[PDB]
Design a protein around this ligand. Structure first.
Ligand code: UVS
Ligand code: ZN
Length: 140
């Protein structure tokens, strides 16, 4: 579990969005595993605006943050998980590391701020849904 809290936006994995998220929906994309909802209180996070390929992510199933190198966001085939069938996922970055389903929502961060959230795992990789292209998160 986990979210990004930027301005008056909550960014969550689409598959973990609540009824309240859907009732306060700003934007969602199943192909990216992302959903954004509106918040009453302003959030503490800053979105990275960069093309870094190194950062640190939080792994809940280890209670640990790991430094990783990761691929640039791409359209990637993802094998079946507990929460999605085998399918193509867009705007996905991969790193070598541990990820189980409950790790989804952990933040990946670089020197510029939040890069994305854990979205995929298995076979010794962790996949992250990028948010750095979502420039509208920074205003309004
Ligand atoms: C296509 O759906 C976008 C949205 N729907 N309700 C909102 N409040 S934003
Ligand atoms: Zn960066």
């Amino acid at each position: 579990s986990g979210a990004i809290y930027v301005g008056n936006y909550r960014v969550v994995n689409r598959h973990l969005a609540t009824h309240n998220d859907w009732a306060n929906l700003v934007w969602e994309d199943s192909s990216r595993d992302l959903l954004v909802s509106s918040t009453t209180a302003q959030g503490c996070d800053t979105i990275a605006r960069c093309d870094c390929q190194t950062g640190v992510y939080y792994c809940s199933s280890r209670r640990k943050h790991y430094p990783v190198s990761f691929s640039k966001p791409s359209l990637i085939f993802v094998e079946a998980s507990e929460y999605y069938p085998a399918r193509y996922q867009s705007h996905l970055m991969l790193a070598v590391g541990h990820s189980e389903p409950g790790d989804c929502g952990g933040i990946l961060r670089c020197q510029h701020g939040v890069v994305g959230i854990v979205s995929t795992g298995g076979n010794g990789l962790v996949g992250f849904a990028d948010v750095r292209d979502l420039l509208w998160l920074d205003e309004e």
